[PDB]
Amino acid sequence: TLIECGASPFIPGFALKDVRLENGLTVRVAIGGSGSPLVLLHGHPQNHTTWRKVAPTLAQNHTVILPDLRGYGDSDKPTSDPAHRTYSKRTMAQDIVMLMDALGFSRFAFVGHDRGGRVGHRLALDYPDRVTCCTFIDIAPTATMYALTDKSFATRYFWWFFLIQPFPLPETMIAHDPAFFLRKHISGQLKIEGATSQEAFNEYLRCYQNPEMIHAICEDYRAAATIDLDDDAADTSARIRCPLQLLWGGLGTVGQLYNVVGTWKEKALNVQGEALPCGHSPQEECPEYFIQKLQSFLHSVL
Amino acid sequence: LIECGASPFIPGFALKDVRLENGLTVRVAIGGSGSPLVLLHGHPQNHTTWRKVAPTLAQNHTVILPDLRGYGDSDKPTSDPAHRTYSKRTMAQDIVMLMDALGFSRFAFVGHDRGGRVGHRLALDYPDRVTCCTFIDIAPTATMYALTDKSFATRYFWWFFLIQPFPLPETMIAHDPAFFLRKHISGQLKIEGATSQEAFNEYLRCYQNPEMIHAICEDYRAAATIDLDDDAADTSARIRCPLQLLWGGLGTVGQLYNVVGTWKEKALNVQGEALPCGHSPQEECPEYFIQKLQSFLHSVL
Ligand SMILES: [Ca+2]
Ligand SMILES: [Ca+2]
Ligand SMILES: [Ca+2]
Ligand SMILES: [Cl-]
């Protein structure tokens, strides 16, 4: 089913909808434009408004679909399970093809940022015929990150060891001052004169202040250290079939620590990538440069 | 020395503030008679962690229980940007200075947690002053950071949280000091109830001071930075005095390393065993801790 929730107050030309999937979950989505389907999927601690600066341009040549991850934004936030399956990337990925089935699309182009990229990686493996191409933003594979855990990794990515502690520790810490934690996750990501306005920060905060999101976020991270790694090892011999593009911040953390394109070679057939003049979020920090790079890739995929 | 009255938790012991040569003042509990035996606590306790074993040990020794700088009721001086102020070299200097001021020469040493990391540096910087060492539930700092892997960073996540740049961890702990103390103590102990509510209350009295929370962080930052430099600068050196390792079979350090093995690479004369407890045998299984320490001190002294 589709319920219409008015126009997007943040992204001109896009309509907000609540879509009920066959797995009984309801997701919040913003849709705009016309043409071949393009899904842009946000990460943590954002929601789909992270695409507000690029989405309208992209909508000129595509039907742009901006979902809120389960547990995030305004999508449902189901209570979880002890193995964290409910927030595994496999379940998240399944949410994405079921949404597409519900909007009537068959094959689609996919772009994913932060958590959204991890969902995408699993999406491209579980449903290789559905995805025409992939663009993963500012991430190296989940299994690779944890496998290379060293003093330096654990220091620079300390949340990857804090957000995974057993319930309710991280949930309790964050709840002490949600805005403070959000600032760390956002001002650490940018650090280049105001890529996130007070209005956009308030919108992300509005969502982040819901303890149900706080918990989903921790379950997502817990899954990434457990069930997601089980799933990723079970089919480690498999490779992403569609063309893959990596876009990452030359001044972000992952770009300063690893050869980004190099981390995706064993995981995919045809790969390519480049560093952008920003930190963690090129769609917010250097939108115009981001669009150009995404357009070239999308239009090159036959 | 300035008398502060009888200890309210350790029968027969007196509390004192002692002013060292480096201008610092440390709180110390002293009881007993005989040769000096230093027992140095770690994080997030104070010298009261030794309340269960100290009076028994006081029968044959003059037992000295300092609060590390930055902890308990000792001074908590302003730190420096390199973290040298809370480095294990400096902390060790406080100890030898404390002994000079109490008039003692050579002494026996025991260190738990941060206290044992201090003793490591102590035996290396002042080999003549130490008759013997016992380190409790610790593998050397350099070995721990070097073997950093997923389960380690997960099990000992605070080694990556307390070292985040100022003022992040401090701000987070300040939101609810008692909550974060409780999680530490719960994660340390395996023998449930080894830290009574009264004992916990005494640790909380000190931990809720923001000056203590900052110093704790500085201490961990030292261990991730300047401490490792010192350890590399004399990597060929080895502890000469007899070394004993007592750790908890049921805890993290016990399950991740060959404890005795990690120390053989740092010392000439090494022994030790796992006790049926978590991180703090002096509180979780006092009788077996006393028995084990006494045989070592007797076989050596
Ligand atoms: Ca593989
Ligand atoms: Ca005390
Ligand atoms: Ca416990
Ligand atoms: Cl991520």
PDB file of all heavy atoms in Angstrom, chain A residues 113-115 118 138-139 160 221 280, ligand 4:
ATOM      1  N   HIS A 113      25.248   5.598   1.034  1.00  0.00           N
ATOM      2  CA  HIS A 113      26.211   6.291   1.906  1.00  0.00           C
ATOM      3  C   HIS A 113      26.263   5.706   3.315  1.00  0.00           C
ATOM      4  O   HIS A 113      25.226   5.443   3.895  1.00  0.00           O
ATOM      5  CB  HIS A 113      25.826   7.780   1.993  1.00  0.00           C
ATOM      6  CG  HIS A 113      26.694   8.595   2.899  1.00  0.00           C
ATOM      7  ND1 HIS A 113      26.179   9.393   3.898  1.00  0.00           N
ATOM      8  CD2 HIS A 113      28.040   8.728   2.967  1.00  0.00           C
ATOM      9  CE1 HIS A 113      27.170  10.000   4.528  1.00  0.00           C
ATOM     10  NE2 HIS A 113      28.307   9.623   3.973  1.00  0.00           N
ATOM     11  N   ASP A 114      27.484   5.463   3.835  1.00  0.00           N
ATOM     12  CA  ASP A 114      27.681   5.049   5.233  1.00  0.00           C
ATOM     13  C   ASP A 114      26.882   3.733   5.409  1.00  0.00           C
ATOM     14  O   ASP A 114      27.055   2.804   4.577  1.00  0.00           O
ATOM     15  CB  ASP A 114      27.275   6.290   6.088  1.00  0.00           C
ATOM     16  CG  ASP A 114      27.474   6.140   7.580  1.00  0.00           C
ATOM     17  OD1 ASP A 114      26.602   5.530   8.221  1.00  0.00           O
ATOM     18  OD2 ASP A 114      28.428   6.764   8.150  1.00  0.00           O
ATOM     19  N   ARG A 115      25.970   3.638   6.381  1.00  0.00           N
ATOM     20  CA  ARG A 115      25.225   2.384   6.531  1.00  0.00           C
ATOM     21  C   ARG A 115      24.569   1.954   5.223  1.00  0.00           C
ATOM     22  O   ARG A 115      24.442   0.763   4.950  1.00  0.00           O
ATOM     23  CB  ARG A 115      24.128   2.473   7.593  1.00  0.00           C
ATOM     24  CG  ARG A 115      24.540   3.102   8.914  1.00  0.00           C
ATOM     25  CD  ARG A 115      25.841   2.548   9.416  1.00  0.00           C
ATOM     26  NE  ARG A 115      25.708   1.189   9.869  1.00  0.00           N
ATOM     27  CZ  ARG A 115      26.748   0.460  10.283  1.00  0.00           C
ATOM     28  NH1 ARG A 115      27.961   0.964  10.254  1.00  0.00           N
ATOM     29  NH2 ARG A 115      26.564  -0.758  10.722  1.00  0.00           N
ATOM     30  N   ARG A 118      26.564  -0.291   3.061  1.00  0.00           N
ATOM     31  CA  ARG A 118      26.695  -1.663   3.564  1.00  0.00           C
ATOM     32  C   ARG A 118      25.443  -2.433   3.169  1.00  0.00           C
ATOM     33  O   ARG A 118      25.481  -3.637   2.815  1.00  0.00           O
ATOM     34  CB  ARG A 118      26.934  -1.653   5.077  1.00  0.00           C
ATOM     35  CG  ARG A 118      28.102  -0.749   5.424  1.00  0.00           C
ATOM     36  CD  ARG A 118      28.559  -0.739   6.881  1.00  0.00           C
ATOM     37  NE  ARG A 118      29.621   0.285   6.960  1.00  0.00           N
ATOM     38  CZ  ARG A 118      30.887   0.127   6.562  1.00  0.00           C
ATOM     39  NH1 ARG A 118      31.355  -1.043   6.127  1.00  0.00           N
ATOM     40  NH2 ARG A 118      31.705   1.143   6.630  1.00  0.00           N
ATOM     41  N   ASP A 138      32.082   6.687   0.740  1.00  0.00           N
ATOM     42  CA  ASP A 138      32.917   6.786   1.915  1.00  0.00           C
ATOM     43  C   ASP A 138      32.995   5.573   2.846  1.00  0.00           C
ATOM     44  O   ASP A 138      33.102   5.733   4.078  1.00  0.00           O
ATOM     45  CB  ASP A 138      32.586   8.060   2.719  1.00  0.00           C
ATOM     46  CG  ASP A 138      33.821   8.627   3.389  1.00  0.00           C
ATOM     47  OD1 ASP A 138      34.771   8.978   2.649  1.00  0.00           O
ATOM     48  OD2 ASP A 138      33.857   8.698   4.636  1.00  0.00           O
ATOM     49  N   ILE A 139      32.984   4.376   2.253  1.00  0.00           N
ATOM     50  CA  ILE A 139      33.138   3.134   3.001  1.00  0.00           C
ATOM     51  C   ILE A 139      34.056   2.088   2.352  1.00  0.00           C
ATOM     52  O   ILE A 139      34.261   2.041   1.146  1.00  0.00           O
ATOM     53  CB  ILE A 139      31.788   2.442   3.237  1.00  0.00           C
ATOM     54  CG1 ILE A 139      31.107   2.067   1.901  1.00  0.00           C
ATOM     55  CG2 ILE A 139      30.874   3.324   4.096  1.00  0.00           C
ATOM     56  CD1 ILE A 139      30.043   0.988   2.043  1.00  0.00           C
ATOM     57  N   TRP A 160      32.814   1.979  16.599  1.00  0.00           N
ATOM     58  CA  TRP A 160      32.638   0.603  16.113  1.00  0.00           C
ATOM     59  C   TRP A 160      32.858  -0.441  17.189  1.00  0.00           C
ATOM     60  O   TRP A 160      32.527  -1.629  16.992  1.00  0.00           O
ATOM     61  CB  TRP A 160      33.567   0.345  14.934  1.00  0.00           C
ATOM     62  CG  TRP A 160      33.068   0.952  13.661  1.00  0.00           C
ATOM     63  CD1 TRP A 160      32.664   2.251  13.460  1.00  0.00           C
ATOM     64  CD2 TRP A 160      32.973   0.302  12.376  1.00  0.00           C
ATOM     65  NE1 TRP A 160      32.316   2.430  12.162  1.00  0.00           N
ATOM     66  CE2 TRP A 160      32.471   1.261  11.468  1.00  0.00           C
ATOM     67  CE3 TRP A 160      33.247  -0.995  11.918  1.00  0.00           C
ATOM     68  CZ2 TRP A 160      32.247   0.975  10.121  1.00  0.00           C
ATOM     69  CZ3 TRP A 160      33.004  -1.288  10.571  1.00  0.00           C
ATOM     70  CH2 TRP A 160      32.524  -0.306   9.690  1.00  0.00           C
ATOM     71  N   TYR A 221      24.786  -1.478  14.347  1.00  0.00           N
ATOM     72  CA  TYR A 221      26.198  -1.648  14.639  1.00  0.00           C
ATOM     73  C   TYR A 221      26.478  -3.009  15.218  1.00  0.00           C
ATOM     74  O   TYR A 221      27.407  -3.639  14.788  1.00  0.00           O
ATOM     75  CB  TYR A 221      26.716  -0.556  15.531  1.00  0.00           C
ATOM     76  CG  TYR A 221      27.044   0.680  14.747  1.00  0.00           C
ATOM     77  CD1 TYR A 221      26.028   1.487  14.230  1.00  0.00           C
ATOM     78  CD2 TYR A 221      28.366   1.039  14.501  1.00  0.00           C
ATOM     79  CE1 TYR A 221      26.323   2.607  13.517  1.00  0.00           C
ATOM     80  CE2 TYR A 221      28.664   2.168  13.775  1.00  0.00           C
ATOM     81  CZ  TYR A 221      27.634   2.941  13.305  1.00  0.00           C
ATOM     82  OH  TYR A 221      27.915   4.058  12.602  1.00  0.00           O
ATOM     83  N   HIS A 280      33.555  13.131   5.025  1.00  0.00           N
ATOM     84  CA  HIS A 280      32.688  11.973   4.945  1.00  0.00           C
ATOM     85  C   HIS A 280      31.414  12.008   4.076  1.00  0.00           C
ATOM     86  O   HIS A 280      30.961  10.965   3.617  1.00  0.00           O
ATOM     87  CB  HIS A 280      32.293  11.629   6.380  1.00  0.00           C
ATOM     88  CG  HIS A 280      31.450  10.403   6.509  1.00  0.00           C
ATOM     89  ND1 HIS A 280      31.892   9.157   6.127  1.00  0.00           N
ATOM     90  CD2 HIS A 280      30.220  10.222   7.037  1.00  0.00           C
ATOM     91  CE1 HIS A 280      30.953   8.263   6.384  1.00  0.00           C
ATOM     92  NE2 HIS A 280      29.935   8.883   6.952  1.00  0.00           N
TER      93      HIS A 280
HETATM   94 CL    CL C   4      29.312   3.339   7.840  1.00  0.00          CL
END
